[PDB]
Amino acid sequence: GSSGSSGEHGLLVHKAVDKWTTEEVVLWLEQLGPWASLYRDRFLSERVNGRLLLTLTEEEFSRAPYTIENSSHRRVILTELERVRSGPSSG
C-alpha cells in the first residue's frame, strides 16, 4: 500500500536473497537489530546487493571494509541469511 518506499516485511523469504537489491539487502538486515544502522552505510556505499550478500562469508564480514569487529553481528547476519536463503523443502 502507501507504506513508505516500495517494500514489504514478509516477501523477503518468498523472494530469493540472490535477487534482492541494495535496498532490500539493507532492509532485511535493518530488521535483525537496531545496530544494523551501524553497518547499513557499508552496505549502501558498497552497493552490496543480495547476490553479493550471500557470497559474503564469516570471513569477508570480519574483513574490511566491513571489518565487522563483532562476532555476534556476523552470527545474526549469517544465521538470518541461512533462513531467508533456505526456504521450505516440501519433500
Side-chain angles (χ1 to χ4, degrees):
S2 65
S3 298
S5 70
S6 283
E8 188 196 303
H9 65 162
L11 83 310
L12 270 289
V13 302
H14 285 293
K15 169 195 203 88
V17 171
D18 330 54
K19 272 55 169 78
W20 294 6
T21 50
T22 323
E23 210 154 69
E24 291 325 280
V25 178
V26 177
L27 270 186
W28 158 84
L29 164 83
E30 272 197 279
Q31 281 170 92
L32 321 191
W35 48 250
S37 162
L38 303 169
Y39 303 83
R40 76 183 272 183
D41 281 48
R42 311 201 150 78
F43 283 52
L44 289 309
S45 208
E46 291 298 291
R47 305 271 274 164
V48 185
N49 73 85
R51 210 286 199 80
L52 179 73
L53 179 67
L54 295 173
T55 72
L56 295 162
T57 67
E58 180 191 63
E59 270 153 300
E60 290 274 66
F61 281 127
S62 208
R63 307 291 290 290
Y66 327 114
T67 189
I68 301 167
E69 304 201 328
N70 185 38
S71 306
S72 196
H73 183 259
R74 280 190 278 85
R75 182 273 200 69
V76 177
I77 287 173
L78 278 165
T79 297
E80 288 271 338
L81 211 69
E82 161 152 305
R83 307 210 64 204
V84 294
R85 84 184 193 158
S86 192
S89 288
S90 207

